[PDB]
């Protein structure tokens, strides 16, 4: 009947809010370390300006 299928299909919409947190969970977490991947842009800056010191 119509009233019981409405709630389980609401759980389908309540499963896409778990994706609305997930695509700001993984994307927050993966490129937080890509911001820490710019330490390697500093590690080339120190070692190439190690030459100007040398």
């Amino acid at each position: 009947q119509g009233i019981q299928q409405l709630l389980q299909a609401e759980k389908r919409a309540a499963e896409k809010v778990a994706d609305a947190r997930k695509r700001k969970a993984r994307r927050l977490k993966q490129a937080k370390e890509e911001a820490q991947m710019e330490v390697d842009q500093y590690r080339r800056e120190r070692e190439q300006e190690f030459q100007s010191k040398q």
Binding site: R46, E49, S52, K53
Partner: protein
């Protein structure tokens, strides 16, 4: 900016001390031309001591 600013400053201190001892070496090498001149003059007073008709 703590890696490049010290190595230019320590370059300046190294250039300062080398320029100063470039002046202090040539000035100490100015004495030994004067000190031996007073030593060579001190030798030649003793030759004046020898000849008595000039020494008396």
């Amino acid at each position: 900016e703590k890696k490049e600013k010290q190595i230019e400053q320590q370059k300046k201190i190294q250039m300062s001390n080398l320029m100063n001892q470039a002046r202090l070496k040539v000035l100490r090498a100015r004495d030994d031309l004067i000190t031996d001149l007073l030593n060579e003059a001190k030798q030649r007073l003793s030759k004046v001591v020898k000849d008595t008709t000039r020494y008396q």
